[PDB]
C-alpha cells in the first residue's frame with residue numbers, strides 16, 4: 001500500500017450532519033434548505049481536505065481556486081455516492097438525511113438523483129473500496145478541466161501523481177483484474193455528467209446567492 005492512498009485515507013473529512021428541522025413539515029422548500037445548509041458546511045471541510053492533497057497547496061492561489069471552482073460539485077456528489085453503496089434506491093446525503101425516490105420527486109431532483117443512482121449501482125457491481133473512493137475523488141479535483149490554469153505543467157504533474165497512485169494501488173490489491181484501474185477511470189464520465197447537470201440546476205433555480213463562488217473559495221482558502 002503506497003503513501004498517497006494512505007495519506008488520502010487519513011485526510012478524509014469527518015462526518016457532517018444535515019440536521020433537518022423536525023419542526024418544518026416535509027416540503028420541496030425544506031429539502032433545498034437542508035441540502036443548501038449541508039453543502040455549505042461540507043464546502044468548508046472540502047477545502048481543508050484539498051490542502052492535504054500532495055502538491056495542491058504549492059499551486060498558485062488562482063490555480064487552487066480554478067480547480068475547486070471546477071470540481072466542487074463532483075466532490076460533493078462522489079461523497080453522496082460512496083455513502084449510498086450499502087443502501088437500496090436511496091441517496092445518503094448524511095447519516096441523518098436519506099432521500100428515496102418519492103422525496104427526490106418532491107425535491108425536484110428525480111432525474112439528477114436517478115443518474116446519481118446509476119453511478120451508485122455501478123460502483124456496487126465493481127465492489128468499490130474506500131481507498132479507490134478517496135483516490136478517485138482526488139483525481140476528480142485534479143482532472144477537472146478548468147478553463148484558465150496558470151501552470152498547466154504543475155497541474156498535469158498532480159494529475160499524474162494521483163493517476164500513478166491509482167494504478168499502483170490496483171496493481172497491488174487487485175491482481176484478479178489487470179484492468180480495474182481503467183474501469184475506475186471509465187466511471188469518471190458519469191460523474192462529470194451528473195455534476196454538469198447539477199451545477200446547471202444550481203443556477204437555473206438560483207441557489208448561488210449574492211457572493212460569487214470564486215470569492216467564497218478565496219475566503220476559505222485564506
Ligand SMILES: CC(C)N1CCN(c2ccc(/C(=C(/CCCO)c3ccccc3)c3ccc(O)cc3)cc2)CC1
Pocket residue numbers: 032035036038039040042076077079080093109112113116198199201202207208209216
Ligand atoms: C449560497 C452558496 C454559499 N451555496 C453554496 C453551495 N450550495 C449548494 C451545493 C450543493 C447542493 C447539492 C444539491 C443536491 C444535488 C443533487 O443530489 C442540489 C440541489 C439543487 C440544485 C443543485 C444541487 C448537494 C449535493 C451533495 C451534497 O452532499 C450536499 C448538497 C445544494 C446547494 C448552496 C449555497
